[PDB]
Amino acid sequence: PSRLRKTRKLRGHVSHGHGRIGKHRKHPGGRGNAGGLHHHRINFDKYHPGYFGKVGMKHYHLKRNQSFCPTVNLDKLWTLVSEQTRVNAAKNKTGAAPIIDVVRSGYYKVLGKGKLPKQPVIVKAKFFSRRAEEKIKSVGGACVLVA
Amino acid sequence: APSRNGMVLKPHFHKDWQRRVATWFNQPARKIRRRKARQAKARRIAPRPASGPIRPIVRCPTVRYHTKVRAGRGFSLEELRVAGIHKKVARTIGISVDPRRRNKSTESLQANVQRLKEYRSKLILFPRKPSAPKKGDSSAEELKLATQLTGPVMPVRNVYKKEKARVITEEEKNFKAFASLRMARANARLFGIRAKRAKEAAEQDVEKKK
RNA sequence: CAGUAACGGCGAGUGAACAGGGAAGAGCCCAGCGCCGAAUCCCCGCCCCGCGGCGGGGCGCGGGACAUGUGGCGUACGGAAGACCCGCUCCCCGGCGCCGCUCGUGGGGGGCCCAAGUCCUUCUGAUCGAGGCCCAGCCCGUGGACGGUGUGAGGCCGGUAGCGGCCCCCGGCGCGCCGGGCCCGGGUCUUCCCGGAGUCGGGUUGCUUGGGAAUGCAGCCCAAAGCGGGUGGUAAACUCCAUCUAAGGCUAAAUACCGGCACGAGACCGAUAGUCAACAAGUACCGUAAGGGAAAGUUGAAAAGAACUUUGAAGAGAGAGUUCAAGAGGGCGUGAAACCGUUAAGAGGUAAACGGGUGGGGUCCGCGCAGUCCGCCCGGAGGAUUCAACCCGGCGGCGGGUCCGGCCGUGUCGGCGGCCCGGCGGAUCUUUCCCGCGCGGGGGACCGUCCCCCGACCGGCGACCGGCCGCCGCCGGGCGCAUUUCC
RNA sequence: CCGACCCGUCUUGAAACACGGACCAAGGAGUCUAACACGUGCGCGAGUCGGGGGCUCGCACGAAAGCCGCCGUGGCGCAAUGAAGGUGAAGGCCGGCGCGCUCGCCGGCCGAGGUGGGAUCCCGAGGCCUCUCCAGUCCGCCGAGGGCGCACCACCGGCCCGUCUCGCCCGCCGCGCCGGGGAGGUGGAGCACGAGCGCACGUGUUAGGACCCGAAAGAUGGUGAACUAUGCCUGGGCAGGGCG
RNA sequence: ACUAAUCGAACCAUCUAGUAGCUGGUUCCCUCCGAAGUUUCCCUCAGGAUAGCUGGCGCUCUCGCAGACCCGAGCCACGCA
RNA sequence: AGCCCGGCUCGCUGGCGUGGAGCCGGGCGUGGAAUGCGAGUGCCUAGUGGGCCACUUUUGGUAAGCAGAACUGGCGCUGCG
RNA sequence: CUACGCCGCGACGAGUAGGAGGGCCGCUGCGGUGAGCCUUGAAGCCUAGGGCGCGGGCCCGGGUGGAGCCGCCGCAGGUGCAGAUCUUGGUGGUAGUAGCAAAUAUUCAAACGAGAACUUUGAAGGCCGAAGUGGAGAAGGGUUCCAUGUGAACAGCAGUUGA
RNA sequence: CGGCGGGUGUUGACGCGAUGUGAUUUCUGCCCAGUGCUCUGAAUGUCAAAGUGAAGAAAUUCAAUGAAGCGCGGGUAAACG
RNA sequence: CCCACUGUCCCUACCUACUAUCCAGCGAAACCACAGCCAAGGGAACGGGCUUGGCGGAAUCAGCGGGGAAAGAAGACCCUG
RNA sequence: CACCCACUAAUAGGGAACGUGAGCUGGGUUUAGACCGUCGUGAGACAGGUUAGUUUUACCCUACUGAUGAUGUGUUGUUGC
Ligand SMILES: [Mg+2]
Ligand SMILES: [Mg+2]
Ligand SMILES: [Mg+2]
Ligand SMILES: [Mg+2]
Ligand SMILES: [Mg+2]
Ligand SMILES: [Mg+2]
Ligand SMILES: [Mg+2]
Ligand SMILES: [Mg+2]
Ligand SMILES: [Mg+2]
Ligand SMILES: [Mg+2]
Ligand SMILES: [Mg+2]
Ligand SMILES: [Mg+2]
Ligand SMILES: [Mg+2]
Ligand SMILES: [Mg+2]
Ligand SMILES: [Mg+2]
Ligand SMILES: [Mg+2]
Ligand SMILES: [Mg+2]
Ligand SMILES: [Mg+2]
Ligand SMILES: [Mg+2]
Ligand SMILES: [Mg+2]
Ligand SMILES: [Mg+2]
Ligand SMILES: [Mg+2]
Ligand SMILES: [Mg+2]
Ligand SMILES: [Mg+2]
Ligand SMILES: [Mg+2]
Ligand SMILES: [Mg+2]
Ligand SMILES: [Mg+2]
Ligand SMILES: [Mg+2]
Ligand SMILES: [Mg+2]
Ligand SMILES: [Mg+2]
Ligand SMILES: [Mg+2]
Ligand SMILES: [Mg+2]
Ligand SMILES: [Mg+2]
Ligand SMILES: [Mg+2]
Ligand SMILES: [Mg+2]
Ligand SMILES: [Mg+2]
Ligand SMILES: [Mg+2]
Ligand SMILES: [Mg+2]
Ligand SMILES: [Mg+2]
Ligand SMILES: [Mg+2]
Ligand SMILES: [Mg+2]
Ligand SMILES: [Mg+2]
Ligand SMILES: [Mg+2]
Ligand SMILES: [Mg+2]
Ligand SMILES: [Mg+2]
Ligand SMILES: [Mg+2]
Ligand SMILES: [Mg+2]
Ligand SMILES: [Mg+2]
Ligand SMILES: [Mg+2]
Ligand SMILES: [Mg+2]
Ligand SMILES: [Mg+2]
Ligand SMILES: [Mg+2]
Ligand SMILES: [Mg+2]
Ligand SMILES: [Mg+2]
Ligand SMILES: [Mg+2]
Ligand SMILES: [Mg+2]
Ligand SMILES: [Mg+2]
Ligand SMILES: [Mg+2]
Ligand SMILES: [Mg+2]
Ligand SMILES: [Mg+2]
Ligand SMILES: [Mg+2]
Ligand SMILES: [Mg+2]
Ligand SMILES: [Mg+2]
Ligand SMILES: [Mg+2]
Ligand SMILES: [Mg+2]
Incomplete structure (x- = not known):
C-alpha cells in the first residue's frame, strides 16, 4: 500500500526528508561494503568482530551428509513413543x-x-553421551547401539 | 554505507540480472498442460497402469538417508534371472529393468525378487489376438477385472518392525555404550600405527640375540 | 542442498556439486574378434500393380561399387558354436467393406441455421428511458457475455446456451480377405572369442573454473599399457579396496521462446498517455552515407453540407433555409488559462500588488416589510364518533414447584447394545484359530476418542422451543350516544 | 490610516550589485524486486510453513478457490562449543560406611539453587454499622504486621564445549603411545522447564538505472577523401611591356 | 594543420538510464515533539563511519483515585537534582 | 543496602578462641540538612558533523568587521516592543 | 451511552533540518454497498450568486454542455507542483519598433484590367560595353521548358506578372 | 592479424633509406669524464629454459656446465651535450 | 632618421551620394522576478524597493551612451575533485 | 611614474568601481605561431628579452539633451509678472 507510506506525507517539503545541507546523493562513502578497513572500520570492529582473516583448516568438497547426526535430549525422549506405551510401561x-x-x-x-x-527403558541409538548413558542406567534402563 | 548494528549482506545483483528473470505466470497453464498430457497418456495405454513400469525396492545411498527406502530406476538383472524372467521380456510386461545396478547384499535381492514374483502373480496379460487366447490369461478374469491402475505400482513403504517390551537383562545393564564407542574410535584411529609398531618390534625381536 | 563447500589485493566480491523430493522416463547401434561360396549396395533398359510425396514385384550372358571389405549373427547387460531338454509360442508392411463411430462427451478444418415485447400509456430530435402487463405475478432463459441499432436493449438484429441440427473434406485406431516378405526361442553343460593411439598420460604455456601444489579447454614437447587404463576434491612413494571401461555413433518426453501464424484475457494507458507510429508512420523531412525520424483522433442521428434574394472583382457579408442544436457550418464534440477587442462601473502625480481596520458605492440574497411557534389550562361559540367501565375474539410481554413435553450441560451407572449388528485411531498385546521360512501379510483381543442408543440422578428453561394456566398490555368487533372523549 | 523589499536555493549571514524565474496550460522526480534488522497486527504454537508437485466438469469469474499427510522432501526453530579429531548442557535434603580423607558405593524423596528488590495475590490482630444495652448470630469495608512471590534487574552459586595447572583413581573380549573421571582459573555468538514458524504492514540500511536531470571520458562494430591534405592518370589555361 | 561548418584523435549506432563525495529540483493540510556544525578513526579536509544532540514505539514501577451532593479522619511515596 | 546483638563457614591469614570475608537469625523508624521534582529501563532511528556573534578570561598580530581557544547566552531555527 | 461514544477539571501552545499522528483533505482504478443519481439533462467548464471548514477543500444557485457520474466500508497506485538555464504546446511587452540603404536611373503616353510605381506596347534617357548584365555547353537540378487559365497561399511593397 | 605476404623496387652505393645544418665567402677550437651509439671476445664475473650428474622411495633438493644481455677493454662530439 | 608630401594635428569648416528622419505597404529578434527619480544611513561591507530626508503631474518624438554591478557563454585565469 | 627642452602669473596635489573599452585606441600585460638566453634527460617552464596576433549588441527603462503636449482660468488671443 503506497498510500500508507512516508512519501505521501513528504509532498511539499523540498528536501523529502533528506536534509538541505547534506542532501541525498548517490553513494557517499562507497558502494556495498566499501572501506571496511579504512573509513567504515569503526562500524565493522564494533558490530562484526572477527570479520577479516582466515582461521582453521579448509576442507575441499565438504559433504554435509557424511556428518549428519541429529540429536535428541533425554527430557524429550519419551515423546518419541505414544503415551499408550508410557502408561503401559508405568503401570506394568x-x-x-x-x-x-x-x-x-x-x-x-x-x-x-x-x-x-x-x-526402565531400552534406547536404540547410534551414539550416546556419557551423561545420557549414566541417566538411562540410573533409572534402571539400558542402552544399546545400532549401525 | 553501514548503519549501526546490522548483518553484513552480500547481494548477488552485480551481474546485470534483469535480462535473465524467470517469471512463473505460466505455472498454472503448465500444470494444466501436464495434467492434460497425463490424462492423454493414461487413455492411450488403456489397461496398463497409469504411472508405468513397476520400480524396485531401493535403499538410499548416504549415511543421512540409508534408513529410508525408496523406488529405483529398474530391476537388476540378477533379480530378473533368479525370478525367472527374461531381461528382454520384462520390459514388454511393464517391468522396468536396470542393467547397470548390482546387488551387493542378499536381503535386498530377496526383497526385490519377492516383489517381482508378487507382481507377476497380480499381472493380467492380454493375448495378442483377442479371439485366439493362446497362453496369456483366461477370459473370465480379464473381462471385468481389468482396471486402469492409478498411482505408482505397488508403492514403496517404510516398514518399521516393532519390537515388544521386554525385561532388561543384566548383560544389557552392564553394557558400557559410551566407553565402547570411545574405544572403538580409538582402535579405528590407532589400528595401522599399532600394526606398524608390532611389525617393528617383531623385526627387532628376530635379531636381538646374536 | 545453499549464498553453503570453496575461490578472492581471503578486500570488494564471487560461488557449484552429491544425497533427498518431484516433472518425464526408453533404450540402443557399429568398429573390432569371428562364422557364412559378397550372403551386400547403386544405376540403367523391359513388363505388371500403382501414381499422387514416385514405390512393390518379376526379367536382363545389362553396367558399376565392393576382398584397401558390403550384408546377416553379434557389442561389454558378455558373445558365438556344439550337444541335452523344454516350448510352437505368430511379426511388421499397404488396400478391400463396416461397426465402435476418433470420444469429458465431433478427432480435426470449413460452411449454413436454431428462444423470447418492438404489447399498452407516456418522455424525447430519436429513443434502448419511465409506469403497467389479473393468474404469484408479460415472454424466453442450458440463452441476463458482447456488439450494433438516432439513449442507457435478455426479448429489433448478429450472436450467446446447448453430449443442438444439417452439409462438404481430411486423418489414425478391429474384424475376414488381398500381394508377398517373415524365420527358432528359452534353460543346462562343454569348447572357443573379446575391444576404439599422436589417443591416454606427463611437462610447460595461455585462457577458464568454486576447483584450491593446478576444474576444464587448447597450443608445443615427450609419448603409453593390457591381471591394463581412468576416477576415489592436498603434492609424492609403497600397499589394500571400491568404482567405471575413455579416445566411435544414434535416441522421444519432461524444458526454452521479447521473431512468425492464429487466438483469449487484463485491478494496465487513454491521443504531450499507451509502441516511434490509434491517422496515406518507419511516412513527411534531415544527412554524402552509416543513420536520425516526427506532428497529426472527434460536425451531425441523418449532409439534412446552407437553395434562393441582395453588396462587393472576389475573399467575405446581410437576409433566407436545414437541424433539437450551426451560440454543431468540412481540422466543424466540449471549449479553460495566458493574451487581445469592445461595452458597463469605479479609480489614477510617490510603479503596481499585499496584511489589518473601517467607510462609501454597486451586483445580488433574504417570498424582509406589520414578524414566529406550540404543550397545558381558562372562557365562548359548533360538531362528531363514541370516553371510561364490562363482553367476545386475536396477538404479544412476564412468572410457574417443570405445572406437562421438548429438552440442554456436566459427569454416573449395566452396557442388550459396534470390528457379522456404528466409526476413527494406537511405537498396546497376539496365529500360540489363517495362505509367505522354525521366517510375512491377514484375522483377533485390548486401550483412547467415540457413534447414535436404553433409562435414572444432578443445575436449569438458558439468550433452544411448544401446551397449559395467572397477571399485564395492545388491537378488532359489540354495549356504552353524553357533566365522558376527541376534532 | 497603520503595517508592509521577491519568491525559490546555497549559506554564519539574501531584498541583495548572488544564482533560476516574461506569462499560461499539460507532463514532471524516494519507485519495484531481492536480502536483512526492529516494531506492530493475525494464525498455529515446540512446533510451524506446501512456496515445488499432484488430485478435483480444464477454462464466465476460475491463471481463482478447495484438498493431499506414507507429498513435510525440505527450510527455520528445538543445542552449543572447538581450527579439528571430537565432545555435548540437573541439582537439593535426610542418611547410615571407607577415614562421610573436601570424597568413593547405594537408599529415600523432591525436581533447575540461593540472596536483595518485586506489580499481583493470601492470612490478618484491631476498627467502621443502627433507639441502647449484658447476647452471639451471616456475610462488606479500612487495617498495623506477616506470607507465597510473576515478569524483570543486580549479585553469588551450578551445568555443557575449548584451553591451561595440579593430582588421584576407575574400566576392559582389543591391556593399550587405550578409554574414562576429579579440583582450581580462564575463553564461548551456551544451559539453567522452550518461542518459534508462516503471512501482512510500517520504518531504517544495502545491491540493483535506484528520487529525477547532468559530465570530461572508455569500449565494440560500422560510414565518410562531394570540403580539404598528399601521390598517380587524363584534359584545360596564363593580355601588354622592362632588363637583356 | 587538414580529414564533409566537427580535429591535441572525425562521424553513426550500441555497451549506456556509464560514474559523479559536485550543481539544480524534489508536488496536500492541520497537530505534537524538535536539533547539529562537537569527540575518535579514515590518501580524510566540499565526504563517510562513530559517539553526542532528535523523534517514535513502548515497558517496569511510584502517590492515590475515597466516601452516591455533603464530608481527612511522632507518621505522611520508590527515586531523582 | 544503616546501627547494634548473637551464631556458623573458610582450603585465605595465623602465637592466640587471631584477622578478614561470606552466611544465618533477632532488635532497633525521631525516614537522621534545606528546597524542588514522580522515577527507572529497553528497542529502532532521522537530520547533523562549513558555523557565527556578545560580556568576561585569553593566544598570535601594529591592527582588523583578522586568525585561534575557555564559560555562559543568543543568532542559525525567532516572531513581537 | 456512534463506549473508536459522551462529560468534567487543570496546565500548556515559537520553530529550520528532522521525526510522528490525524485528515468526514484531494486524484485514478478494483471488491462490496447506497431498490444511489442521470436525456424532466451526467462529466466538464464559466460565474459581482449563498454558505461551510483553522486548513487541505466541500456543498448548493445560475449559465453552457450533451452521456455518463457519485457517496460510505475495504483494496491498489504511474496519486497533489511555481521553480529543476525543467519537456511539449500556446501567448505577451519589446513593437507597428529595428529594418525592407552593395553593384549610376528612370520618365511620358496608351492598352488590358474592379484595381497599375512595378504587367504589356510605343517614345525618351541610361547601364552591361565582346575578359558582357550577350550567344552556347559539362557537373548538378528534374519538368523548372511551351501554351492557356486563376489570383486562395508564395514571390519579405505590389502585381493584370512569375521558375 | 596471417601466408618467404607487401613498399622502396620497372630499384643496386653517382642507389635507396635516416638525420642535422641551411645560398655564396671565411672559419668550424678543446673535452669520450656522464648519457648514448658502436668494435672485440681474451682467460673471461654474473646469467633463464632445456639438457647432464648426485642424494632420496618419489615429489623434490643440490651441484656442475654457462646464449644473448649486463659488467670488463677500445672508438666516436658536423651524437646528446 | 632625412627630403618631399599632405586636415594626423593646430582647429575645425563646407560640399556630394546612401541612410538615419516623416509617410504608404510590409514587418522581426535579443531580453524580460516585479519594476524603473535621488542623497545619506544600515545591510551579504557600492540600493530601484527598506529607514530618514529631497520630492513626485497624462501621452509622446529624435538623440544619447552615465547607470540597470545591461545582454551574450553553468569563468577559459586560481583552487578543489 | 621619471627626466630634459621652452614658454609661463603658475606650470599645485588628489577623488569620482586605482572615473571614464555597448566612448575610442590596442602600445603593454595575458591564449594559440615563432626566435634568443637560462633551467629540465624530456614534454616543457621563466613578475627574462623580441615579433605577429577578431575589441561584438541599445530599438528597452531611467538619467541627460533637445522637441511636441498635458493640469486649471467657459473658449480663444495679445501684452505681461
Ligand atoms: Mg519541515
Ligand atoms: Mg557539509
Ligand atoms: Mg539455509
Ligand atoms: Mg565469474
Ligand atoms: Mg513421476
Ligand atoms: Mg563385417
Ligand atoms: Mg447499445
Ligand atoms: Mg444489449
Ligand atoms: Mg434473435
Ligand atoms: Mg454455439
Ligand atoms: Mg589425498
Ligand atoms: Mg485531449
Ligand atoms: Mg503518441
Ligand atoms: Mg544540405
Ligand atoms: Mg483576398
Ligand atoms: Mg447545444
Ligand atoms: Mg468547437
Ligand atoms: Mg542555490
Ligand atoms: Mg559566502
Ligand atoms: Mg532569499
Ligand atoms: Mg548589493
Ligand atoms: Mg553575476
Ligand atoms: Mg551557482
Ligand atoms: Mg534570467
Ligand atoms: Mg524557464
Ligand atoms: Mg500540472
Ligand atoms: Mg490454488
Ligand atoms: Mg526432514
Ligand atoms: Mg526472587
Ligand atoms: Mg553464573
Ligand atoms: Mg538498521
Ligand atoms: Mg538516474
Ligand atoms: Mg549520462
Ligand atoms: Mg580508462
Ligand atoms: Mg577529391
Ligand atoms: Mg589509509
Ligand atoms: Mg555546497
Ligand atoms: Mg573567529
Ligand atoms: Mg544553515
Ligand atoms: Mg533553540
Ligand atoms: Mg530572539
Ligand atoms: Mg508548535
Ligand atoms: Mg508521478
Ligand atoms: Mg507549471
Ligand atoms: Mg518548490
Ligand atoms: Mg522604421
Ligand atoms: Mg530602406
Ligand atoms: Mg557604358
Ligand atoms: Mg551567358
Ligand atoms: Mg509580396
Ligand atoms: Mg517559363
Ligand atoms: Mg639539407
Ligand atoms: Mg664543434
Ligand atoms: Mg658472458
Ligand atoms: Mg674526438
Ligand atoms: Mg542612492
Ligand atoms: Mg562554473
Ligand atoms: Mg565551464
Ligand atoms: Mg578604472
Ligand atoms: Mg562604460
Ligand atoms: Mg569594448
Ligand atoms: Mg600588441
Ligand atoms: Mg603567444
Ligand atoms: Mg600580421
Ligand atoms: Mg528610429
Missing part, C-alpha cells in the same frame, strides 16, 4: 521395559540434557 506389574528407537524417529545421538522419569 512385571519389570518389562519398552524399547525406544530414536533412529526410527530420525535422531542419531542421544544427548543428556534434562532428567528422566524413574522407570
